[PDB]
Enzyme design. Structure first.
Site, PDB file in Angstrom:
ATOM      1  N   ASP B  31     -21.165  18.831 -18.590  1.00 35.11           N
ATOM      2  CA  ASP B  31     -22.582  18.720 -18.197  1.00 35.11           C
ATOM      3  C   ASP B  31     -22.891  19.306 -16.819  1.00 35.11           C
ATOM      4  O   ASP B  31     -24.051  19.609 -16.528  1.00 35.11           O
ATOM      5  CB  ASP B  31     -23.056  17.266 -18.251  1.00 35.11           C
ATOM      6  CG  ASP B  31     -23.285  16.778 -19.673  1.00 35.11           C
ATOM      7  OD1 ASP B  31     -23.417  17.615 -20.586  1.00 35.11           O
ATOM      8  OD2 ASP B  31     -23.338  15.570 -19.971  1.00 35.11           O
ATOM      9  N   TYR B 144     -22.198  -3.283 -20.405  1.00 30.33           N
ATOM     10  CA  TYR B 144     -22.456  -2.432 -21.567  1.00 30.33           C
ATOM     11  C   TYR B 144     -21.796  -3.002 -22.819  1.00 30.33           C
ATOM     12  O   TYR B 144     -20.685  -2.616 -23.177  1.00 30.33           O
ATOM     13  CB  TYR B 144     -21.891  -1.037 -21.329  1.00 30.33           C
ATOM     14  CG  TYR B 144     -22.556  -0.170 -20.262  1.00 30.33           C
ATOM     15  CD1 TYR B 144     -23.918  -0.295 -19.954  1.00 30.33           C
ATOM     16  CD2 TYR B 144     -21.834   0.818 -19.608  1.00 30.33           C
ATOM     17  CE1 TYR B 144     -24.528   0.539 -19.011  1.00 30.33           C
ATOM     18  CE2 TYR B 144     -22.445   1.662 -18.665  1.00 30.33           C
ATOM     19  CZ  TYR B 144     -23.791   1.505 -18.372  1.00 30.33           C
ATOM     20  OH  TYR B 144     -24.427   2.310 -17.444  1.00 30.33           O
ATOM     21  N   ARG B 146     -20.386  -3.275 -26.299  1.00 33.83           N
ATOM     22  CA  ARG B 146     -19.897  -2.179 -27.128  1.00 33.83           C
ATOM     23  C   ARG B 146     -18.699  -2.678 -27.899  1.00 33.83           C
ATOM     24  O   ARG B 146     -17.857  -3.401 -27.356  1.00 33.83           O
ATOM     25  CB  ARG B 146     -19.510  -0.972 -26.259  1.00 33.83           C
ATOM     26  CG  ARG B 146     -19.363   0.343 -27.007  1.00 33.83           C
ATOM     27  CD  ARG B 146     -19.226   1.562 -26.076  1.00 33.83           C
ATOM     28  NE  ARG B 146     -20.468   1.803 -25.344  1.00 33.83           N
ATOM     29  CZ  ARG B 146     -20.576   2.439 -24.184  1.00 33.83           C
ATOM     30  NH1 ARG B 146     -19.519   2.941 -23.557  1.00 33.83           N
ATOM     31  NH2 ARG B 146     -21.773   2.586 -23.647  1.00 33.83           N
ATOM     32  N   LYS B 175     -26.042  -3.493 -13.469  1.00 34.93           N
ATOM     33  CA  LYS B 175     -26.589  -2.298 -14.076  1.00 34.93           C
ATOM     34  C   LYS B 175     -26.514  -2.408 -15.600  1.00 34.93           C
ATOM     35  O   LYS B 175     -25.429  -2.598 -16.157  1.00 34.93           O
ATOM     36  CB  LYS B 175     -25.811  -1.092 -13.572  1.00 34.93           C
ATOM     37  CG  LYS B 175     -26.087   0.174 -14.328  1.00 34.93           C
ATOM     38  CD  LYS B 175     -26.119   1.372 -13.425  1.00 34.93           C
ATOM     39  CE  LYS B 175     -24.944   2.266 -13.607  1.00 34.93           C
ATOM     40  NZ  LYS B 175     -25.168   3.224 -14.708  1.00 34.93           N
ATOM     41  N   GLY B 201     -29.074   5.160 -16.090  1.00 34.70           N
ATOM     42  CA  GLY B 201     -29.848   6.386 -16.216  1.00 34.70           C
ATOM     43  C   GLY B 201     -29.948   6.974 -17.615  1.00 34.70           C
ATOM     44  O   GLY B 201     -31.067   7.189 -18.110  1.00 34.70           O
ATOM     45  N   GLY B 202     -28.793   7.252 -18.229  1.00 31.70           N
ATOM     46  CA  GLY B 202     -28.715   7.803 -19.578  1.00 31.70           C
ATOM     47  C   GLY B 202     -28.696   9.333 -19.647  1.00 31.70           C
ATOM     48  O   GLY B 202     -28.751  10.001 -18.617  1.00 31.70           O
ATOM     49  N   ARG B 230     -27.354  12.018 -14.464  1.00 34.65           N
ATOM     50  CA  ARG B 230     -27.739  13.269 -15.132  1.00 34.65           C
ATOM     51  C   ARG B 230     -29.212  13.662 -14.963  1.00 34.65           C
ATOM     52  O   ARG B 230     -29.538  14.841 -14.770  1.00 34.65           O
ATOM     53  CB  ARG B 230     -27.446  13.161 -16.629  1.00 34.65           C
ATOM     54  CG  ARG B 230     -25.982  13.249 -16.968  1.00 34.65           C
ATOM     55  CD  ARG B 230     -25.656  12.711 -18.344  1.00 34.65           C
ATOM     56  NE  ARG B 230     -25.630  11.249 -18.414  1.00 34.65           N
ATOM     57  CZ  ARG B 230     -25.293  10.557 -19.505  1.00 34.65           C
ATOM     58  NH1 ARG B 230     -24.933  11.187 -20.620  1.00 34.65           N
ATOM     59  NH2 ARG B 230     -25.309   9.231 -19.480  1.00 34.65           N
TER      60      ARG B 230
END
Lengths: 252, 250, 250, 250, 250
Positions: B31, B144, B146, B175, B201-202, B230
């Site tokens: 990225d 997160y 998952r 976060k 953010g994502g 990003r």
């Protein structure tokens, strides 16, 4: 600054050639048969000295029994075998403190990003890194993505990922695989930033000129140099070809 | 009171923007190509400083080679790769004591509630929390959910669970992922109680406006601010867009 | 004698009511919606004080941010989530020494006899028990057989096994599930011997009279009292019903 | 010489009877129903005393709450349940140091040779053995091959393997299953060498005469004695039968 | 130089014979029946000294109860059973410090290169090697590739890999399996470099001359000598055959 210490010891001419010799545990001795003197660590030390290379890589047992202080030593702390069939994992068989006692100027450690055991190696590398800082020995990380989603280890994106992980985890220098062309390899070198990159040697090439062409590309991409094993010591003209590599790398 | 310390350092203006830069280990460098300077941590520190942001997030290796004291640092202690296929797990590659030595004002740690390995991260977090208290550095938990029964990570009930778990385990700040609307996200903020919440953010949004509207909703829900990666540094107009965010949040 | 200390602190009138509030990690915040104030730990402490209950149960995060010394505290050291799908396991996220620092008068720990991870929890409980003795804090064991060959958790023989295991491992007091009748529950109480037994509250009953009748049975069986959560704070008449329980138990 | 210390304390008359009482954790309380006083550790101590037996075996919790110094104690350090379904494994819930404080004259530890987890118990036993030497407490190993290639645990070659492993790993005395005949049992006794062998009691027999015949065979085979549980305390005439066992053995 | 110390103690005549006796744990006592005195460690010590051998190999339990200083001792630190069915693994049941206390002149450890657990033994061998150096006791590695891709344990390429691994990991001396001919075995000896090689004995051969011919091949290939177990003590003429082995080797 341990990168600066690494460059002073292993790259005094601005570039570096390291003679790798961890093959006895990683692959076993079968390949020593083509040039049988290659099974003798004493021969390996003489070859590095005679070709004017910067250093050698040994496991602890070879360092304890053979290392004589004649060429700078990177003590490779972990090892595994090719006989093993599980998810890729290589654990330390030596500590940094012991490496200091054996005469090492740096320590080495392999990680396999992507492995189901990637967490085991990251956890242990954290303790090794902390000890490397404590004993003021540079940490050289062999970064070889393997397992998990990895299907082509020389893909441009995988080699660049290898390079960046090594920087993120605290390597002072690193060893990664070549992509096969200087453009894509130059991206791996770029994302490594301040940490110098050495090309991993690989299996013996079909011709000497194939290997020299790969080395030329690695240098064009801005890499520090090469860590070569088989492509020197598996050849019967090992010394003559080693001296040709020296002229390409140091002279070029 | 380490929440009070966190707020003094990273939210002096009452709200917070942190520039996240753990991407190189978490997702790899692909990225960075869209805006090639983004691969350079020096470029990232300048961007944070020049946009007026409160902090940056680095892994230990980037901090040791590049951190220069110019912006407050959150040292992200654990890291995993996207090459990995097993049950979600991320182990510490750095201690709190080493973070202090690298110039950190806070430490960060990711948990994955629901994972087959959830226990491994709770066990390590217990040690990190005890050390954060000992060294007086606030603990910021990336929460997160998952693996296990988790199917939709942005479902309202999952983001609220993520937030409550972080409070229960001892986070001084947290976060979490945005739900996509301010009403459901306000429930997550409520169950977090006295512990402030930052929006994760994502991936880079289709337009700059899409992201601004996300941040607006986050603030309406009573969150402290954003931790953005990003959606700033993957843009060729990184500095300009980063200054627009600052105007919005602050 | 840590049982004697436990009874002095948590059962001064001869019987005990503890308000359990580890639900934020164990089940998540979904159930707090019924009576929204239940998501605020300040409200929980108020309920406990105003009903004249003997103690509260918090995780470390809640105790650190909210505990105010107004009601005796049992610090619950381990926690897991319902999002997790593996063999049942719950690891400590806090030490006994840290519990002492947070103002705890006792510590709590859950075991799941029968789990494929039963070894992991027995190994950690050993360390916790040793520390509980060292710091002179009673150890309260939640004994919940689950996984392996366990098919019906409220079967008479399973609840009796749960009670005996807690005694054998060194519990100073214990918390187990109700069998649904005083005759079989009296056997679990007998096999616990000198260690007092608290009924686990369970999910909110259909009516208030259903729960009161469970409590009546529990006391008839010789149990010390109840550790109740949802059946108090999930009701909008929480204080009124709490006072009715105090009337019955004391 | 911890074998000699073991014999002095637990076999002063030349042979040994130890009353085993770890059943509460290993099997649960169901078997206490036949003779309900058996659920009460006080009754067990009175029984061992009144019958003139040499010792009792308690887990740490029972010892802490009930042990009164009236009969010599073996502290059984590890325990597992029958609810567990995995590869056989039993971890320590108590240390040797703690056993000393609780008044133990010896410590006990179960191994399951052949288990997928045999390594886990051998690794822990190494630590326990080192501590037994340090605190001068004899180590009594319950050697019960289970899992892996093991099918019938009373087969002659399995019981002899059990005895030999216990000797090799450092047992000062051992407890093993009976083969059902004195000739094969004597081979197990021989390969155990200088380490004395106690017969494991087993399930309650159809008649008292069946059990007495088994004991006669154990003694003929040259074993030290018996570690009996159910075949004494599961009987309504427990004390009468215990006194008959004493007359036979001593 | 610990190889030099090993050679002084266990190879004073220039070649070495060690009497191996870890069979009790590795295989169990079944084989002891052929020559029943072989179950008695006192007989094994008398046998080694009467034959003029250089040493014996015992596990910790046998050394503690029976070792009398009469023949040099290699303490075999790890052991596993044949009852076990998993990936090959053998963990230490004794420390190097304890081995010193028991009168050992060297320590032994088995590794299984290729095993799914190869990492677990490499990680433990690292601590043992560090301790061997600290206490000045030579480390003798039994290198037996097993599991993973290994299908013929006596193949030339596999035995050479076994030898090389032991050198790389820090062995001061090694024990490996014979390939069946002196030419291929001499390549294993060569790649072991400065570290001397002992031939592993194996199951009892059909005749004495079959075993003698193997030993002749081993010496022709340049090995230091042999570590023999069954092919001596499983024979009714153990002492006679042991004396013939000594004549050949010395």
């Amino acid at each position: 600054n341990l990168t600066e210490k690494f460059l002073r010891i292993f790259a005094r001419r601005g570039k570096s050639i390291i003679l790798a010799y961890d093959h006895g545990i990683e692959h076993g001795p079968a390949d020593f048969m083509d040039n049988p003197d290659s099974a003798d660590p004493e021969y390996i030390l003489r070859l590095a000295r005679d070709a004017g290379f910067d250093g050698v890589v040994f496991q602890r047992g070879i360092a304890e029994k053979y290392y004589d202080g004649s060429v700078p030593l990177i003590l490779k702390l972990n090892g595994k075998t090719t006989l093993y069939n599980g998810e890729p994992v290589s654990v330390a068989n030596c500590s940094v403190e012991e490496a200091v006692s054996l005469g090492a100027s740096a320590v080495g450690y392999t990680i396999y990003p992507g492995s189901g055991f990637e967490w085991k190696m990251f956890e242990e590398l954290a303790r090794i890194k902390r000890d490397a800082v404590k004993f003021d020995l540079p940490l050289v990380v062999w970064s070889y993505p393997r397992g998990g989603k990895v299907v082509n280890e020389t893909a441009p994106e995988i080699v660049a990922y290898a390079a960046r992980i090594a920087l993120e985890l605290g390597a002072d220098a690193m060893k990664i695989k070549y992509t096969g062309d200087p453009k894509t390899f130059s991206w791996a070198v770029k994302v490594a930033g301040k940490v110098p990159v050495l090309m991993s040697g690989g299996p013996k090439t079909k011709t000497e000129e194939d290997f020299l062409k790969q080395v030329e590309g690695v240098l064009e991409a801005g890499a520090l140099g090469i860590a070569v094993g088989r492509n020197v010591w598996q050849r019967r003209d090992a010394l003559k070809f080693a001296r040709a590599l020296a002229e390409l790398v140091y002279g070029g």
